[PDB]
Structure formats: C-alpha cells, structure tokens
Design a protein around this ligand. Structure first.
Ligand SMILES: Nc1nc2c(ncn2[C@@H]2O[C@H](COP(=O)(O)OP(=O)(O)NP(=O)(O)O)[C@@H](O)[C@H]2O)c(=O)[nH]1
Ligand SMILES: [Mg+2]
Ligand SMILES: [Mn+2]
Ligand SMILES: [Mn+2]
Lengths: 173, 292, 496
C-alpha cells in the first residue's frame, strides 16, 4: 500500500529499434514477455513502488527506436529525469549507437552529465550474442555511467533492478 | 462451426430441473473457444459501448440462473449485454455457462460483451472448480484451450462516456485510461499491479484512501477515491461486481459506485438475490432483482 | 491549474520561444491568447482534456508540429487551413468519429497519427495528403480504404492494423516506397496481386485476418525479414514463395489450416532461424525436410496431429528448441540421442509411457517438459543430463524416481505433481540448486526424506492432497515451511 505525497521519477527508455525497450518495460509493469515485434511511436506507464524503503511513483516513457517512427522523440526525452540507454547484445549497430544516444541526452537536457544507465539486453540469446560483457563495461566506463545486463524473456533478468537502479542514480546525484 | 445448433441445444434444457447437463462435443467447445478468442483480440481491451445495455455481475457457473437472466432481460439479440466476469468456478455447470456466453459472443459480436473476472485465470480456476469440471466431462487439453481464450478477454468498458465498468475495481496505478489500452494480450493476470487491481480490488467504507485487502491480493479503496476518480475522468458511475451482495446489488459512495452480483443464492451458503442493471438511451439505470 | 497555464503562455511570448509545452496540465479549454504566440514552430498539448481546439490555433502559421495525443477531441477548427508548414499531426487516443475535414486540406503533412479514435471512413480526399511518409490509423473501425490510397506515393509506413478491413485496394501497389505495411488484426479475405509491386517492403503485418492464400507475387518482396501468418485460413503456400524470400529470418504458420508441410522441399527452409507451426492439423513431418535448414534452431509443432517422428529426426543437429506438445506421440525413438545441441524439449500432452535410453545423450538439455503423458518410469540415463535445470513430470504414472535423479545438480525446478509416488529417494538431498519442488496430488505419498533438508535453496514446495500420514498432523497442516523445518530438526542434518 503506497504512502501519501510521493515524488514522481520520469524515466525514459531510449535506444535503437528492436533492442527490447518495450519488452523490458512491459515485463517490468505487466510481468509478461511479449514475443511479437510492434514498433513503438510513444507509450507511457505508471506504477507506485517502494525502492530502498522509500515509496516512489515511476512514470516510464517508452520511445521509438526506428528512424521512421521517431517524430517528437526529442520533446518526449526533454521531459525525462533519467534515462535507460538500451542496446541489444545481438545487434552490433545498436551498441555502436550508444554514443549517439548519450550525446542526444546531454544535448536535449543541456547538461554535461545526467542520470543514465547502460542496459545490455537480450543476454538470454547466448548463441547470437555479439557484444561481450567486456565491451559493455568498457562503453559504460567511457561515459562514467553504470552497466547492467538484462533479459526481458521469462525468467526475466535484472528488469526491476535496471529501473530501480535508475531511480537510485536520480536520488543519489 | 455450427453455431445455431450449439445455441439451440444449450437452450433446449431451458425449463428443466437444474443440474441437467448439455453434452456438446469436444470439437464444438474448442471451436467456441477458438472463434471467440480471435473476436476478443479483434476488439479493444477497453471497450467503448453505447446504451441501451443490460449489465450483469458474477454468474459462477449457475447456468440455470443465467437462463433466467436472459428470460427477464431478453435473449440476445433482443437486448445488448455486458457481463463483468467470473463466468466459471463454484457453480455446478461452468461449462454450459461459458459455452452459451461464448456462443452469443460469436453470434452477436457487436451486441454482446464479456469482461474478464479474476476467475478467468488458470491459476484461480484450477482450484475453485473449472479445471475439475473440465477434466471430468472432457479433458485437460480443453481446459487449457479455455485458458488461451480467457487470456484474451477485455478488461474494462466505458458506457457512453459515463459509466466505467470492470470486475473488481480501481487501482492506485490507474491514472489515465490509455494505461488500460497498453495492457497486452494474451496475458495471464499478474500477482500485483494495474491488471491485478482491475480484477481484484474492493470498495470499503471504513478505509480512507487505499488499504490492504483481506483477500491477500490487491487493495481496498474508499469513497473519496471513487469521487476523485469520477471527477478526474468526467464519469458518473463505476459499475463493478466481484462481491456477493444480499439484495443483488449495493450502492457505494452515495450511489457513485454500484456492485452487481448476478448469481442468486451464491454457492448455496448465501441467501442473496441476483441483480442486473439496465441502462437506457439516456443513461438512466434500473435494477432488476433476480429471485433465488 | 488554469492559473499556471496562462502563466506559461505569458512566459512563452515574453521569452519569444519557438516551442510551447502544455502537456499533462488537465487543460479543458485552451485560452484564446495563444493567438499571440505566432513564433511557435512546435506546440505540445498532449495528455490533457481538450474536447475541441479554439480557432485561434489557426493563427500559429509557423507550426511544424501539432501534438494532441490523449485528449477528448471530437473535431478540429477549419482555421487549421492556415498551418501551411505543418509536418507532424499527432491525434492518437482521442474521440474522432471521422478524419476532420480540415485535416484533408493539410497538404504539407508528412506524419499523421490517428490511432485509437472511432473513425469509420477514409475519404477520397486522402489523396490531398500526397507528401505523407507516415500514416497510422490503427485501432479504429475502418472497413474499406479508397483507391486514392495509391496517390500517397511517398508513403514509407502505412499502418491500418486493428480495423475491420475486408480487402485492400489493388492501387496499394502504387505506393512503391512502402517499407512497413501493417495490416494485422483485420478481416482481410485476400491480398492484391499488386502487393508484389512493393519491392522495398520489409515488414508486412498479416496475422489475425481471414486469408485463404498468399499471392505468388509476394515472392517479389525479397526484402521481407519475417513472414508471420498466425491466425488465418491458410493451408498451402505458393510454389516458390519461401525460397524467393532470401532474407527470411522467421516463418510463422501458427493457427491456420495446415494438414501438410508446404510443398517445395528442403530449400524453402534454408534461411530461417525459427519455424512456428503450432495449432494446425499437420499429420507428419516429411523425411529430409530440414536437411538444408542449417540455421534453423527453433521448431514449434505444438497442437498438431503427429503420431510419429520422421526417421531422420536424429539428424536435426542444429535444433536448440523443439516443441512437440499436444500431439499423439506414443514413443520417442532412440535416435533422439543425435540432438546433442538441444536445450529445450517440450513433449507435454502426448501418449508417452517410457523414454528412450538415448535421452541421456542430450548433453546440452536445460528444459525437459513431459507433463500429461502416461510415463510409468524414467530411464536411468536421465542422470547424465547435467545441464538440466527444469524437469516437469506433472500428470504422469510415476511410482518412484530413479536414485540417479540426485546427479542433476543444476536442477532448480522439479515438478512431480499428480503422479503415483509412494516415496522420494534420499538422493534428492544432493539437488543443491533445487528451488521449486511440486509434489501436490500424490495421494499415496505418506512420508518425505529428511534429506530434503539439505536442499538449502528450496523456496517453493507444494504438497496439497498428499496424505503425509507418517508426519505429525499438526506439521503437515502447517504447510511446507513447517514440514521442512521438522525435517531439519528431527533428522540427522540439524547441525548442518
Ligand atoms: N530473446 C529475447 N528477445 C527479446 C528481448 N527483448 C525483446 N525481445 C524481442 O525483440 C523484439 C523487439 O522488442 P521490442 O521490445 O519491441 O523492441 P523496441 O526496442 O521496443 N523496438 P522499437 O524501438 O521499434 O519500439 C521483439 O520480438 C521482442 O519480443 C530479450 O531480452 N530477449
Ligand atoms: Mg518499442
Ligand atoms: Mn471475482
Ligand atoms: Mn466472484
């Protein structure tokens, strides 16, 4: 049972198309894995949840990763308090594009740094994985941001941790 | 699928003494599940409906009590219907109850609507009867076919912009209607969160805001929650079910919420009437009491 | 707060800012003073309670984005005519019963979102919006599209999913730049042969329609990466479709009318990684069908009419996941030993009474699901399945477990419910990783081994409808946490 006057954390999920932003978000809120791909324009989700025994409202904005779906993405990102930058470990181009999203966040928010976590998704796909844990920790250290590996597929790996850790980053800044 | 023949045989036992089964074939029933499933997925998870409309609460497999409801309200398509969930479990003829409802859904898909209740869920109706009834009269494969179908049922309805209907009630997380639209199907009902609360929560007069629920799942919500919700979304009424009420229906929060229960003398332990609510062209409601 | 709204409007003209964000402010009526802010190029009014837009918005003639998602709009003012630089118009999640007539005159538009309204008709005036590269009108009640759709020659994405379409106009073939065509969840009885004209088509949504066949011309859409026909009325495929789709990663034929594999032989499956044929009536898998399917790693045949497996199924060495659930298999041949790369084997709802010894050679197997068979025993060789994490044996005829079960040290999930078990072997105590143990509905299970107390990670155990009469009635009435504590305290492992 949630408390009373809670703060709201606006978390924005960004990354290339098909990396699993929506599957992670839907796993996090509805606790299922959606296997069929439907590109996002924009969707949002809200929950009351307790993180480190402090009650929070998480407003999660899921953004478009496909170029032709990306109208208004900057404005939606502009409202965020923190970001999950997601790439797929099976998709080399999605990993390379982490720098572009990192740069986009700082430019949209006009800051030299900003709460963000690097999310390496789809690690359940062992035989297709192209980006190693090492490359991932290296990208995160380069940008001085946390690193986390996730899987939206059942049984889900680190999905709640990714979102909760992003709130921690926001609180702890 | 021979739809009219199925409906005929289901309606043949009308008037007979309660308990007399209807033996549809396995392939007939699986056909009902498959054809209704795709119709559920062809329609919104948040239904937007128009009056006139008859709204019914829990049936819980009281097939002969459901036949009485259609007698008073009119058999489809004489009237339009919205049921609020909990078609199976507890009663003696869950199968006949769900099959008639699915047949009507396939037959009159724009005039007959079924919401999901907390018992349209494999983990729950495994325990409270429907699994046993399926395995008795047919097989487990059929029960699992039912689960695939239930997993696609819509979750709430708004009648003419003004009456918000669901099985259970409100959620602390329900802040905009498009959150319901973002619920993906097919889906199981989770242990907590929005979809859980829409199927599981209860109003309570002794609670200020949100409270824990005796069921061990979801929440209770007070009258002030109801009032703020109605004001925010410009609604006039919440219509829900899920709780047996002595006189078939029960108002809450100065008639801003109504609980409907359409299973008279529920389980045999309760001496309760059933009720349905008729909504006319001008959104005026009327309550028909269904005698045990 | 309406106080804040007028305060933000003054701030905008005061700073002379090109962007105005009034989203999520519970605005019912937009103040007419917005007419002053003529420098705006972006106006965000999403997530409010607007039922209409004041005509003064027509004074914002430099707008390129008008964002109105999640309101209660039922029309738009004719003054929007003046917005001759408008590129993006977002009207999702509103209450429009038609495309407002003024929208058909906004010929500068490239991006139009109309999802989740109440629209029944698309007028022939849609041809006015000839610069559209993105049109999404899913989740409405459209039954027909006009031939004038073919005049949107710049379309890249057309999304008409979740409507009531029975046909596509053949003029869709004239939108040659389309790469995304989303038609899923309609009532489509066929596709036009002109669909082959869309040579750049790479994502084609067809599932949940009423298709009886696929046109042969689809073979021209050789950039298709997936073909998912789930829930249609299809029973065959055109002769050279699949081999022509040289980039096909996945093929889904689920929930159709298939009784036989599509003709064409093994070369049709040379590129796909996944084949899903669940919920059909397929009565056999042809000999040699996957001999050229070198990257096919997932095969789903759940809910078909299989009574045996092909003689060469032991050669399916690329397979990682195999679902044969809900068929009528009575045995698994010893040749299963050939699938040494298999990680997931789903065999539930069949007629199996025993398992082959060759099952023990599935060195990579992580999940084995056998619920709802007729299994009377398990082979001793299951002790060799060292990678096994999940073993589901629910609803079978098991009387004992082999003692070798305790060698499955990576097992975390063991489902033994609805069997005929009279006892659990003591060797269950070496299942060091066991987390879930389901014993419910074993009506002749009267005791549990004290060794269960060595399963230190056990956190879920079900024992409903087990008599357990050799334990104290108070303890078994208290449930699994009491039973386990009793086993710890009364057995020889209390100090451990
Ligand atoms: N195996 C596996 N598949 C995943 C995982 N996450 C997503 N997928 C699959 O990958 C596809 C794309 O996922 P989705 O969440 O839609 O991607 P997205 O980042 O939201 N795409 P977009 O930017 O276009 O909205 C879907 O088929 C989804 O089921 C994961 O962790 N593991
Ligand atoms: Mg997405
Ligand atoms: Mn209920
Ligand atoms: Mn109930």
């Amino acid at each position: 049972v949630p408390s009373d006057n809670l703060p709201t954390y606006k978390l924005v999920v960004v990354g290339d198309g098909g990396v699993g932003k929506s599957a992670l978000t839907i796993q996090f809120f509805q606790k299922i894995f959606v296997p069929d791909y439907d590109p996002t324009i924009e969707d949002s989700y809200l929950k009351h949840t307790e993180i480190d025994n402090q009650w929070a409202i998480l407003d999660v904005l899921d953004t478009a990763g496909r170029e032709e779906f990306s109208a208004m993405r900057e404005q939606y990102m502009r409202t965020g308090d923190g970001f999950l930058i997601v790439y797929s470990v099976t998709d080399k181009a999605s990993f390379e594009h982490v720098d572009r999203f990192h740069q986009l966040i700082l430019r949209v928010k006009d800051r030299e740094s900003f709460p963000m976590i690097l999310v390496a998704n789809k690690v359940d796909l062992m035989h297709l994985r192209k980006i190693t844990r090492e490359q991932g920790k290296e990208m995160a250290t380069k940008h001085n941001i946390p690193y986390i590996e996730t899987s939206a597929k059942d049984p889900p790996l680190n999905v709640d941790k990714a979102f909760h850790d992003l709130v921690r980053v926001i609180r702890q800044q | 699928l021979n739809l009219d023949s199925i409906i005929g045989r289901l309606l043949e036992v009308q008037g007979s003494r309660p308990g007399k089964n209807v033996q549809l074939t396995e392939n007939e029933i699986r056909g009902l599940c498959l054809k209704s499933r795709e119709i559920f997925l062809s329609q919104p998870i948040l239904l937007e409906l128009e009056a006139p409309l008859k709204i019914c609460g829990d049936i819980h497999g009281q097939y002969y009590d459901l036949l009485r409801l259609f007698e008073y309200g009119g058999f489809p398509p004489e009237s339009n219907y919205l049921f609020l969930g909990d078609y199976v479990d507890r009663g003696k003829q869950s199968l006949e109850t769900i099959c008639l409802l699915l047949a009507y859904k396939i037959k009159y898909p724009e005039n007959f609507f079924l919401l999901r209740g907390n018992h349209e869920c494999a983990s729950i109706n495994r325990i409270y009867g429907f699994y046993d009834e399926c395995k008795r009269r047919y097989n487990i494969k059929l029960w699992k076919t039912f689960t695939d179908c239930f997993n696609c049922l819509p979750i709430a309805a708004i009648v003419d912009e003004k009456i918000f209907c669901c099985h259970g009630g409100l959620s602390p997380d329900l802040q905009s209607m498009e959150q319901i639209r973002r619920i993906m199907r097919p889906t199981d009902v989770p242990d907590q969160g929005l979809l859980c609360d829409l199927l599981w929560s209860d109003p309570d007069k002794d609670v200020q805001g949100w409270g824990e629920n005796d069921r061990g799942v979801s929440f209770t919500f007070g009258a002030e929650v109801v009032a703020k919700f109605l004001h925010k979304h410009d609604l006039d009424l919440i219509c829900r079910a899920h709780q047996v009420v002595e006189d078939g229906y029960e108002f809450f929060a100065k008639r801003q919420l109504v609980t409907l229960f359409s299973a008279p003398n529920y389980c045999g332990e309760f001496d309760n009437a059933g009720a349905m609510m008729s909504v006319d062209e001008t959104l005026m409601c009327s309550f028909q009491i269904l005698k045990p | 707060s309406n106080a804040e709204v007028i305060k933000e409007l003054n701030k905008c003209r005061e700073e002379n800012s090109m962007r105005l964000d009034l989203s999520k402010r519970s605005i019912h009526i937009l103040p007419s003073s917005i007419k002053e802010l003529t420098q705006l190029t972006e106006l965000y009014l999403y997530s409010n309670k607007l039922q209409s837009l004041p005509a003064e918005v027509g004074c914002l003639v430099n707008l390129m984005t008008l964002a109105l998602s999640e309101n209660s709009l039922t029309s738009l003012p004719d003054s929007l005519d003046n917005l001759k630089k408008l590129r993006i118009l977002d009207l999702r999640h509103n209450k429009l019963r038609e495309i407002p007539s003024v929208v058909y005159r906004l010929d500068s538009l490239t991006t139009l979102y109309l999802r989740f309204n109440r629209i029944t008709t698309v007028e022939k005036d849609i041809k006015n919006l000839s610069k559209l590269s993105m049109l999404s009108i899913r989740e409405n009640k459209i039954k027909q599209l006009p031939a004038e759709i073919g005049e949107l020659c710049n379309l890249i994405t057309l999304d008409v999913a979740h409507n009531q379409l029975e046909h596509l106009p053949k003029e869709i073939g004239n939108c040659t730049q389309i790469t995304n065509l989303d038609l899923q969840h309609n009532e489509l009885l066929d596709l036009p042969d002109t669909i082959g004209n869309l040579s750049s088509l790479s994502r084609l949504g067809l599932r949940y329609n009423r298709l009886s066949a696929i046109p042969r011309s689809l073979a021209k859409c050789s950039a298709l990466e997936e073909l998912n026909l789930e829930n249609n009325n299809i029973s065959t495929l055109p002769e050279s479709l699949l081999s022509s789709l040289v980039k096909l990663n996945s093929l889904t034929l689920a929930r159709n009318c298939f009784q036989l594999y599509p003709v064409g032989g093994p070369s049709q499956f040379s590129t796909i990684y996944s084949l899903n044929m669940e919920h059909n009536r397929i009565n056999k898998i042809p000999f040699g069908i996957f001999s050229r399917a070198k990257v096919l790693s997932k095969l789903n045949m759940k809910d078909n009419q299989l009574t045996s497996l092909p003689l060469d199924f032991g050669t399916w060495t690329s397979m990682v996941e195999l679902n044969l659930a809900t068929n009528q298999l009575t045995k698994i041949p010893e040749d299963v030993s050939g699938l040494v790369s298999l990680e997931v084997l789903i065999l539930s709802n069949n007629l199996l009474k025993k398992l082959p010894h060759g099952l023990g050679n599935l060195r990579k197997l992580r999940e084995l699901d056998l619920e709802e068979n007729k299994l009377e025993s398990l082979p001793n060789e299951i002790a060799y399945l060292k990678d096994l994490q999940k073993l589901v044996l629910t609803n079978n005829q098991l009387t004992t477990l082999p003692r070798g079960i305790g060698h499955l040290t990576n097992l975390t999930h063991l489902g033994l419910g609805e069997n005929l078990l009279t006892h659990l072997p003591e060797e269950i105590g070496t299942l060091e990783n066991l987390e879930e143990l389901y014993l419910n509905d074993n009506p002749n299970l009267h005791s549990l081994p004290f060794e269960l107390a060595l399963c230190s990670k056990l956190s879920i155990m079900s024992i409903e409808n087990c008599p357990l009469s050799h334990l104290p009635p108070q303890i078994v009435a208290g449930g699994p946490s009491f039973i386990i504590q009793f086993l710890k305290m009364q057995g020889p492992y209390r100090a451990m």
